[PDB]
Amino acid sequence: MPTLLRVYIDGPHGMGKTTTTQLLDIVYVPEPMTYWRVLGASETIANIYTTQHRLDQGEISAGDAAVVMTSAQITMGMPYAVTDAVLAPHIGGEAPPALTLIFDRHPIAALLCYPAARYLMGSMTPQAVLAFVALIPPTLPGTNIVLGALPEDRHIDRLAKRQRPGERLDLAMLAAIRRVYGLLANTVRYLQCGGSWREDWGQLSPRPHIGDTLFTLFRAPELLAPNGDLYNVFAWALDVLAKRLRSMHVFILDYDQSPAGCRDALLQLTSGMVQTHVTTPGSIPTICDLARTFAREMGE
Amino acid sequence: MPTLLRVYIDGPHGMGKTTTTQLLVALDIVYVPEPMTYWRVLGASETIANIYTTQHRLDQGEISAGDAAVVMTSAQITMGMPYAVTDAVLAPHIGGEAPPALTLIFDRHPIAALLCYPAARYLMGSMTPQAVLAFVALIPPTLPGTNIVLGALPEDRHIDRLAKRQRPGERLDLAMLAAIRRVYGLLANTVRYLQCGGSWREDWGQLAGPRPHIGDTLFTLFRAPELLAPNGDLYNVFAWALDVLAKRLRSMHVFILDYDQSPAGCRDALLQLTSGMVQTHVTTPGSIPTICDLARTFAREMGE
Numbered sequence: 001m002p003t004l005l006r007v008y009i010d011g012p013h014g015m016g017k018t019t020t021t022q023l024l025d026i027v028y029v030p031e032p033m034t035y036w037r038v039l040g041a042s043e044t045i046a047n048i049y050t051t052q053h054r055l056d057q058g059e060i061s062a063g064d065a066a067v068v069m070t071s072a073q074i075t076m077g078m079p080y081a082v083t084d085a086v087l088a089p090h091i092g093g094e095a096p097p098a099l100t101l102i103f104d105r106h107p108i109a110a111l112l113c114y115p116a117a118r119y120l121m122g123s124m125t126p127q128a129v130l131a132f133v134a135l136i137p138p139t140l141p142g143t144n145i146v147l148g149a150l151p152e153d154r155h156i157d158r159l160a161k162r163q164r165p166g167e168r169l170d171l172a173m174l175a176a177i178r179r180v181y182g183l184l185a186n187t188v189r190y191l192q193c194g195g196s197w198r199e200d201w202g203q204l205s206p207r208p209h210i211g212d213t214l215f216t217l218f219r220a221p222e223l224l225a226p227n228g229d230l231y232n233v234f235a236w237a238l239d240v241l242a243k244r245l246r247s248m249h250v251f252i253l254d255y256d257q258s259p260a261g262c263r264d265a266l267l268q269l270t271s272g273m274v275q276t277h278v279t280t281p282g283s284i285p286t287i288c289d290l291a292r293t294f295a296r297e298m299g300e
Numbered sequence: 301m302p303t304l305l306r307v308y309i310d311g312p313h314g315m316g317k318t319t320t321t322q323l324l325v326a327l328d329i330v331y332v333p334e335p336m337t338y339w340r341v342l343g344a345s346e347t348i349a350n351i352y353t354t355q356h357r358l359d360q361g362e363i364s365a366g367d368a369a370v371v372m373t374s375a376q377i378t379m380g381m382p383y384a385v386t387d388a389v390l391a392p393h394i395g396g397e398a399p400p401a402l403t404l405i406f407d408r409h410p411i412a413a414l415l416c417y418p419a420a421r422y423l424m425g426s427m428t429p430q431a432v433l434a435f436v437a438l439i440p441p442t443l444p445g446t447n448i449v450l451g452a453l454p455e456d457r458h459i460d461r462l463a464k465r466q467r468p469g470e471r472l473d474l475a476m477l478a479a480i481r482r483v484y485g486l487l488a489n490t491v492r493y494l495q496c497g498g499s500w501r502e503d504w505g506q507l508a509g510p511r512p513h514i515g516d517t518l519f520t521l522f523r524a525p526e527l528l529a530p531n532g533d534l535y536n537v538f539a540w541a542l543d544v545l546a547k548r549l550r551s552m553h554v555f556i557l558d559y560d561q562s563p564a565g566c567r568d569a570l571l572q573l574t575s576g577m578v579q580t581h582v583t584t585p586g587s588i589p590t591i592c593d594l595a596r597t598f599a600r601e602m603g604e
């Protein structure tokens with residue numbers, strides 16, 4: 001059966017992702033802006049940023065904000081979830097690809113990364129975060145995630161030039177999301193190099209130190225028993241996080257360059273990405289129309 | 301290789317599901333109980349109480365639809381968390397389909413939290429169909445050997461059974477009882493509809509035993525204007541969500557238990573449904589004891 005190469009462009013917002021992907025037998029599954037603004041709900045991004053500002057200002061409590069913020073992440077990740085679910089049966093075993101599928105973000109952005117960042121912002125409970133983690137779909141073969149690199153100051157500038165509708169320039173959020181994504185990359189290397197979070201959990205009291213991986217965010221008091229022990233439910237969600245992340249293939253793109261270079265660089269990063277066979281002979285056309293239909297309906 | 305038999309006892313609350321399952325285990329059979337401790341303490345504070353007070357405020361007109369939905373949605377996330385991790389952890393142990401070397405009786409299946417209760421709250425007006433379909437899109441892949449037991453119990457009998465057997469924080473909401481009895485009835489029909497060859501896409505315009513009418517399936521709840529494009533058809537994102545729903549429920553083995561009898565009757569009736577249920581092989585030699593510890597640890601920590 002033919003081959004497919006899927007590439008998920010992910011990372012903190014404001015780095016020029018969408019911009020450089022458009023610059024690239026190659027379909028682009030875009031940012032579901034229409035779902036966020038109208039289909040799933042009314043102006044979700046605006047809802048997300050207003051609630052944080054209301055929390056920041058003390059107009060509401062951490063509990064009010066958490067309920068709003070949590071409900072919102074479900075709307076944000078919906079498009080990525082159905083896409084993964086409908087595509088899964090078409091993906092075959094690891095293997096020029098017959099089709100290159102470029103995505104604007106992977107499910108973990110909405111089921112792990114942002115909820116994690118909102119936790120670090122005090123608007124999401126750590127239990128809500130691990131509930132999204134437990135729902136992360138199984139990691140299929142050939143899951144190539146391209147994350148971005150950009151010095152913080154150039155990122156602030158870029159973030160500033162292109163914002164989304166209803167968004168507010170939150171430097172604290174930019175810092176939170178940068179840490180999460182930075183931790184995420186370390187976690188993948190940790191896991192791939194043999195790291196056992198259960199074996200190094202004490203350390204929170206040639207691989208990255210567990211203190212530099214995402215597991216550090218969950219040594220949170222809400223998740224711990226009176227004797228300091230992590231409750232098994234929560235420990236079980238960490239075993240799933242570990243399983244889901246270890247098989248992903250991470251690639252880093254230096255966005256600290258001109259749009260032509262970034263675009264060049266991404267093409268360059270394609271050579272070591274993993275391709276897979278498809279399941280049926282009719283998979284490519286089916287995959288194509290899914291991409292174009294999604295694009296047509298949810299890209300704004 | 302050793303075999304395993306998993307059985308999920310599900311259905312509307314207040315029928316006597318938890319009692320009869322325990323009775324069943326009292327007879328290498330572990331019970332994975334209702335994780336009440338996660339709902340009352342570990343995941344949030346008195347979640348069942350939050351849910352019922354919220355639908356109540358909504359019903360009384362003290363909060364708005366948007367307020368209730370935001371609360372209901374986060375609360376549904378806490379409710380299903382214990383089901384989801386157990387499924388994810390247990391998944392690599394289940395092998396292909398196949399007495400059992402181990403029998404696992406679960407108190408509810410992940411779809412109770414990821415489909416049925418959300419669908420009912422939608423009917424009750426405290427949740428949006430977009431949110432229900434998002435949950436559905438997150439329903440974990442159905443493992444082979446998924447035997448699910450749903451229950452039957454006359455409404456008058458059901459009503460009287462509720463006016464006592466209330467959870468802590470629960471309120472006597474007969475409207476929600478009707479909605480949930482209705483949703484599980486649709487669930488049952490949806491499984492046979494799909495197993496009889498039904499295709500929701502083919503029968504959309506129409507909106508053991510013979511193949512049911514789509515209007516008697518879960519698909520009928522998603523004929524909501526919020527989900528419809530200007531041309532009358534469903535937005536593709538929502539259509540794809542129904543594709544997932546059909547894929548998840550079509551491989552489940554559903555059985556109906558009659559709860560209109562004494563507890564010992566229900567137990568024996570359930571014990572009979574069990575002899576003809578689908579088993580599976582486990583993947584590794586140590587999956588069985590591992591699985592034993594998991595259910596026991598789950599029970600010890602979350603039961604209440």
Ligand SMILES: Nc1nc2c(ncn2COCCO)c(=O)[nH]1
Pocket residue numbers: 013045048073076077109110114115118164167
């Ligand atoms: N998924 C998700 N994306 C977010 C959130 N806050 C900001 N973003 C960025 O996505 C769009 C640009 O702001 C959030 O809470 N969740």
Ligand SMILES: Nc1nc2c(ncn2COCCO)c(=O)[nH]1
Pocket residue numbers: 313334348351376379380412413417418421467470
């Ligand atoms: N998951 C879930 N269970 C509920 C809900 N309402 C009632 N129950 C079940 O009754 C509470 C005791 O199980 C709800 O919204 N979600």
